[PDB]
């Protein structure tokens with residue numbers, strides 16, 4: 006063997022002399038550690054820019070958010086299908102989780118790849134059909150995971166908008182589109198089987214998930230093959246594009262694009278540039294074309310040519326295979342760099358290229374292979390180094406212990422790459438005990454690991470939707486609901502039908518809008534809403550001076566006695582008279598009693614039945630005007646003239662009509678809901694008389710107490726009503742007013758919570774607290790100006806331990822309910838305007854509506870949706886809504902003016 010030894014010395018001798026010369030020729034491809042630190046530092050800056058919302062729009066390193074928040078924990082179970090496309094092979098596996106997987110490779114020729122997105126996806130679908138056939142699972146409904154090795158935009162995990170083609174693929178009409186849906190079109194065109202792509206993940210994510218399944222220290226996913234890329238677990242609080250602050254989420258770096266903006270124009274060489282000039286994506290993936298094992302061999306080829314041309318190789322002799330693009334590939338690079346086998350391989354290959362390689366040439370082309378595969382390994386060490394620093398920092402520790410899961414041919418196959426990369430890495434990041442785990446099995450197993458979870462969520466999101474589905478009414482139902490009210494309106498206005506009508510159409514003896522001749526000083530009560538207040542209104546024919554003071558009524562008095570309740574009112578009145586300096590002279594009062602009252606004239610008003618929060622005994626069936634008088638007596642302090650008993654709708658209508666003659670309808674949407682309008686007397690059957698109109702206090706909150714709305718009432722609606730004071734009463738109102746909506750939302754959440762869909766399945770005392778969701782908060786929650794952070798805060802403020810996810814669902818629930826309300830109220834209001842256009846027999850109506858109520862006033866959407874609904878439900882009308890800013894008081898004064906007038 007003194008021969009082999011003898012030879013080896015010969016080559017080293019031969020080698021030595023040449024190496025110096027080549028190192029100086031390709032000096033540009035000799036990146037010092039210093040430079041590598043520089044590149045490591047530049048990459049950091051690029052990573053910070055991709056995560057930053059401020060800088061992300063022009064950041065080359067996309068730092069795309071995948072929707073994976075943690076590596077496998079063993080909770081995963083089931084048999085899935087995995088599609089792997091973009092690597093070196095198009096495999097279709099069937100993982101079943103121990104983890105049992107079955108792969109299959111399908112050839113994807115240079116016609117499908119560079120073809121049409123349709124052709125491509127038709128190929129993917131066919132192969133999938135083949136697999137499922139072969140495998141005998143087409144019957145079984147199995148979840149599909151898609152390992153798509155390209156840059157995509159995902160908002161959810163089953164969303165995957167292609168940004169740009171990478172590596173070898175370039176099919177027309179895919180970029181910009183949702184690959185998932187594109188895949189579905191193919192499977193449906195074929196209409197062979199049924200498939201649900203529940204997840205779409207990158208191969209670095211898939212590799213990371215795969216390794217983490219085996220090693221729980223796994224936080225990175227690296228790929229060095231047809232293309233290079235890396236992903237890692239990043240803290241949510243830093244992922245600006247995703248709203249959350251708790252936990253981490255995997256970030257698909259897409260580092261191949263590093264340098265695309267020009268950041269590596271000082272590193273990149275003339276060879277890298279020409280390699281680019283003839284590539285499928287000129288100017289893109291620049292960092293990748295210097296590292297990847299799809300660009301490597303061709304890079305060596307471009308160097309060989311340059312030197313041969315310059316007579317520095319094969320005595321300047323060129324051959325046409327040396328010039329043909331792709332004659333020299335990365336496998337040639339790997340072999341030529343083999344330990345013992347290297348030099349002869351260089352020969353066997355180089356002669357295949359037609360140049361008569363000398364022993365010198367073989368020794369040179371091997372060194373040329375080292376500089377190029379080494380620059381590659383050093384560049385990945387640098388950028389991975391940065392990811393490692395970023396991880397260390399996120400940990401706050403000065404030392405890092407993590408695991409990077411690798412995969413990829415160049416790494417897995419080149420004889421010098423792996424260790425050179427390793428050594429260089431740890432010299433750059435000496436502050437870490439980085440391990441590397443090679444995904445021996447491939448990406449599929451990890452994608453199944455993602456698909457298992459994506460599926461689970463997709464499943465629970467489906468049940469939630471089976472719930473909310475109910476608070477979503479079709480225009481056709483809003484149309485019937487409208488038609489249903491109109492029938493009811495007829496039943497209370499008509500003699501015979503009246504006693505049966507649930508929507509009683511109460512005659513308020515207000516026969517006209519302010520005639521501008523009103524004058525005087527009137528006292529006025531406003532009871533029923535949220536704030537009970539006593540007012541003094543000084544009208545003068547034309548000027549209205551107002552004054553008021555809120556007097557709170559305890560829940561106890563409010564639900565006390567007819568006496569306790571009414572004695573309390575008089576005392577407040579007593580105080581107000583003092584407060585005003587009006588005490589003494591008997592004054593004309595206008596009682597705004599916001600409740601169902603049977604009147605036969607202004608000055609009387611028998612409480613038909615309490616609604617909302619009042620439940621004071623011995624009050625129903627009595628003339629409230631009368632009760633007010635007895636209370637004044639028992640007191641024996643002052644006296645007053647109970648001139649009128651008006652409802653708040655009527656009062657609101659007048660307050661607005663005073664300024665706007667066109668206002669003939671009054672709407673209230675606050676603690677409770679109701680409306681009123683100027684009905685033609687010809688129709689007011691309950692009241693004898695034939696001329697003019699009469700304001701009908703449509704007690705619409707009862708619409709449905711007979712059952713005509715029982716097709717749209719949900720089991721949640723039943724509950725609220727069941728747990729209320731007036732159980733079975735005020736249904737239409739119970740699904741619209743601010744005293745009820747919160748309770749609907751609260752019972753849904755309790756439901757979702759029991760299902761584990763929310764607040765981690767635990768029903769907190771606050772969750773069980775009635776009225777926890779006030780009009781003040783619903784309005785806030787449902788606000789768009791409010792960030793998610795803020796919505797989460799309110800909910801935490803309410804005492805509920807919400808997460809950002811809870812904060813989203815809660816927010817969703819509130820919108821389904823308030824929308825349904827704004828819609829239902831719009832249907833009723835729509836009916837009212839038909840009857841007005843029809844009663845006055847006109848082709849087209851222009852009427853104004855006076856509105857008041859905290860919900861209508863505070864809520865961000867209600868009014869807006871409601872306005873649209875009335876518009877779309879009743880096209881022959883142009884309803885205008887006027888917000889009442891002076892309360893029912895002013896209007897109640899104008900009523901007592903004319904009320905005192907007789």
Ligand SMILES: O=P(O)(O)OC[C@H]1O[C@@H](O)[C@H](O)[C@@H](O)[C@@H]1O
Nearest residue numbers: 092093208230231413414447448
């Ligand atoms: O370019 P490659 O050698 O195919 O490397 C990338 C590919 O590696 C395979 O082992 C994985 O299963 C694929 O999910 C990945 O896309």
Ligand SMILES: O=P(O)(O)OC[C@H]1O[C@@H](O)[C@H](O)[C@@H](O)[C@@H]1O
Nearest residue numbers: 534535653675676858859892893
């Ligand atoms: O529930 P609320 O906010 O009190 O809405 C209804 C109330 O609105 C006030 O503005 C009116 O002055 C009251 O007469 C009415 O009863």
Ligand SMILES: OC[C@H]1O[C@@H](O)[C@H](O)[C@@H](O)[C@@H]1O
Nearest residue numbers: 154155156171228232233234
């Ligand atoms: O296949 C490995 C990687 O190659 C890159 O060039 C692609 O852009 C990545 O999306 C992919 O993860």
Ligand SMILES: OC[C@H]1O[C@@H](O)[C@H](O)[C@@H](O)[C@@H]1O
Nearest residue numbers: 599600601616673677678679
């Ligand atoms: O407060 C607005 C409405 O609330 C309902 O609960 C009452 O029954 C109505 O009479 C009133 O108009």
